[PDB]
Design a protein around this ligand. Structure first.
Ligand SMILES: CCCCCCCCCC(=O)SCCNC(=O)CCNC(=O)[C@H](O)C(C)(C)COP(=O)(O)OP(=O)(O)OC[C@H]1O[C@@H](n2cnc3c(N)ncnc32)[C@H](O)[C@@H]1OP(=O)(O)O
Ligand SMILES: CCCCCCCCCC(=O)SCCNC(=O)CCNC(=O)[C@H](O)C(C)(C)COP(=O)(O)OP(=O)(O)OC[C@H]1O[C@@H](n2cnc3c(N)ncnc32)[C@H](O)[C@@H]1OP(=O)(O)O
Ligand SMILES: CCCCCCCCCC(=O)SCCNC(=O)CCNC(=O)[C@H](O)C(C)(C)COP(=O)(O)OP(=O)(O)OC[C@H]1O[C@@H](n2cnc3c(N)ncnc32)[C@H](O)[C@@H]1OP(=O)(O)O
Lengths: 129, 130, 130, 131
């Protein structure tokens, strides 16, 4: 099931060319994944105290069109694959005219954050998705 | 003054090793709140740029009283406390969900022509509003 | 050939939990491409005079092991293919024990800065990196 | 007056729309220079964390006189001007390649135990380095 998250573009996100810096979109995608988890009752600050954490293992981003200061964007996010210790997020960003700006596929691994050691997905998360 | 409130969620990008918000992130938070205060009064800084009007920070003092942390929902509070000629002073504060005062700042802002970095007078539209 | 660029990890690059934030690596790779180009005298000035800019079209990043605060990293960068209007950069990050932390493949398109429309690579870029 | 100098190149990531360096990026640059001044004196904050020693910014004043721009090579200049109990004051400035003064800052830094966010005395070996 799709999760939608709005993001306003501020000065901090722009670069000298007048458009959003290509790495700023990477952060935007992370916020949307965090809010999708939050919507299903997962706080990563809370989980870290339980020695549960999620890290990016692989990421592909393809850039089609720019965003500019003051644009209101929408990040669209789905969990498309789920396995033992990892899951795949498929994401994209559109602007207020529904123009596709870019899209990403993100492989995420569940780890023990003190050992950086992969651990099985909590069955709560497997059931919730 | 007419106070303006803006909520901000703390994400991983805002945090640093050791588990508190990085000190420069607060500076960005304060800027977002000034931008949204302007938006609430019908001003767009992308729009004003084509009109050769922009705002730059000239001086800033920040007090860090207590840390924010990952997943905190914060409130930025913003007032314009002084205006004259080309510049204005914002007084801003940050509180958390307990109403703990985490941070406060005083920001001197100068209106400039962006293609030249010259100070120019605050345009009458702005000063009329605030 | 191979171009090497050192990068020190600072607090701004780290996140809560004590590792480098994943988007920080993306900026590190961009610095190394910029410095690779500079090493061949393709400074920003030189690119502007050639009426070219470079934009990232597609990028894949593999995160094998974390960098941490105070690590001195080495970014290794090579142009692995060059065709028409685009370049592919292959890049890797190792730490001071030569542990492979990260690698990336970056498709970069040559654009004119007016419409940001694709344009053929400058003959000097082609001549230098063939 | 044992000044420490640190060079910084301005990259795209540091700039904002309009073509100047974003005002918060200077704050990061000053932090890098303090960290390198500590490193030159043989201290690592990652290592100090393991000993429950950390440094946090308590107050900062920044003055923006003139902008840095893409690809400028800057020099950050840093001195410790006060050192007392749990805290130090850093005085810093940024010049560009023509020695134009772009920026000045004063930063009050407090030593804390990072697990309790509670101030503690400066490590004796750090006090010895900068006295
Ligand atoms: C971490 C501190 C806690 C706080 C979290 C901070 C949150 C902030 C968010 C970020 O910015 S994360 C920072 C950037 N990312 C990193 O630093 C991660 C660095 N990578 C690692 O440390 C290791 O790669 C990792 C611990 C994630 C995995 O180690 P391994 O090499 O032992 O993984 P392994 O080979 O055992 O396989 C793990 C899973 O990935 C799958 N996998 C690995 N490579 C794959 C691939 N290339 N394609 C498809 N699947 C792949 C693999 O099959 C398996 O799936 P399953 O067990 O569910 O079947
Ligand atoms: C820390 C983990 C590893 C290090 C990471 C370094 C990252 C890189 C550098 C940074 O980015 S630092 C992040 C930004 N700075 C901060 O988060 C510092 C936040 N400030 C504090 O936690 C305290 O002010 C500090 C421990 C430094 C000093 O506490 P004190 O009480 O000893 O000093 P002070 O007298 O100056 O405190 C002023 C006011 O803050 C109040 N306060 C202090 N800590 C508080 C607290 N934890 N919660 C609520 N209020 C607090 C304090 O009681 C007092 O209130 P009143 O004036 O009304 O009496
Ligand atoms: C095009 C940008 C559009 C907006 C995009 C940014 C929005 C996002 C928010 C930010 O991140 S703002 C970026 C950080 N802030 C700055 O870069 C502001 C830099 N400051 C200046 O360019 C000038 O100080 C300013 C135009 C604001 C005022 O110039 P003034 O000379 O009329 O005022 P002032 O007397 O306060 O300037 C103090 C000293 O700086 C000197 N100065 C100013 N501009 C200079 C310059 N360009 N080159 C060398 N010196 C300069 C000025 O002459 C004077 O030197 P002296 O008192 O020692 O004689």
């Amino acid at each position: 099931t799709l999760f939608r998250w709005p993001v306003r573009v501020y000065y901090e996100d722009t670069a000298a060319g007048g458009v959003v810096y290509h790495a700023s979109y990477v952060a935007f995608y992370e916020r949307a994944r965090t809010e999708m988890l939050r919507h299903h009752h997962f706080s990563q600050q809370a989980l870290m105290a339980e020695r549960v954490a999620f890290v990016v293992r692989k990421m592909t981003v393809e850039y089609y069109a720019p965003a500019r200061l003051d644009d209101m964007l929408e990040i669209q996010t789905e969990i498309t694959s789920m396995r033992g210790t990892s899951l795949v997020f498929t994401q994209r960003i559109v602007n207020a005219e529904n123009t596709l700006l870019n899209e990403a596929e993100v492989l995420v691994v569940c780890v023990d954050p003190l050992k950086m050691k992969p651990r099985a997905l909590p069955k709560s998360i497997v059931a919730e998705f």
